[PDB]
Amino acid sequence: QQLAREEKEAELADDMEKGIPQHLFESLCIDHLQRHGASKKSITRAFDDDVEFQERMAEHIRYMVETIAHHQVDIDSE
Amino acid sequence: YQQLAREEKEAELADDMEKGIPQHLFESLCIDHLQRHGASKKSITRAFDDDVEFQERMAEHIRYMVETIAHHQVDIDSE
């Protein structure tokens, strides 16, 4: 039953992850980091060329989305 | 000590860039994109504002992003 709750969370986080593709964060960075010394090329190289970065980026988006899935189910129970 | 000075520059660049990326910019990204994908506004905000572990791990990834971009930027500064 806790194990049925984790299922709901994982399914929900599956859907959320789809609505949060990586280009949203790249856009964010281009828009907010240029004034801080980071050029389009560097942000672009991170997002399009850097394998390790892409993966660690996917890991965290999954964590973000698992965490809010968790809270969504909390409010579903209240 | 040439490579240390490079890393120290990378690190200070990251310090600067980090100020451009407060957490609420990410909260807004999520409320703008996740509502069609199963999340309510409340759930996102609960994560961003009430969940202390989320905040810390959020801060740390942001710091990771900025160090990695800083690294790429100094590489480009040396080509």
CATH top level class name of chain A: Mainly Alpha
Total number of helices of chain A: 4
Please give the largest β-sheet of chain A.
none
The level of helicity of chain A is over 70%
Most extensive interface: A-B, 37 and 37 residues
What is the terminal separation of chain A in angstroms? 16 Å
Fill in the CATH topology of chain A.
Answer: Arc Repressor Mutant, subunit A
Shape of chain A: elongated
Structural class of chain A: mainly alpha
Estimated share of beta-strand residues of chain A: under 5%
CATH superfamily of chain A: Host-nuclease inhibitor protein Gam
Assembly of the depicted chains: homodimer
Tell me what the CATH architecture of chain A is.
Orthogonal Bundle
Rg from Cα of chain A: 16 Å
How many structural domains in the coordinates of chain A?
1
Organism (chain B): Escherichia phage lambda
GO molecular function (chain B): deoxyribonuclease inhibitor activity
Subunit structure (chain B): Homodimer. Interacts with host RecBCD without displacing any of the subunits; this interaction prevents RecBCD from binding to DNA. The GamS isoform makes extensive contacts with RecB, and inserts deeply into the RecBCD complex.
Protein name (chain B): Host-nuclease inhibitor protein gam
Q: Briefly, what is this?
A:
Chain A: Homodimer. Interacts with host RecBCD without displacing any of the subunits; this interaction prevents RecBCD from binding to DNA. The GamS isoform makes extensive contacts with RecB, and inserts deeply into the RecBCD complex. The structure is a homodimer. With 78 residues, chain A is mostly helical.
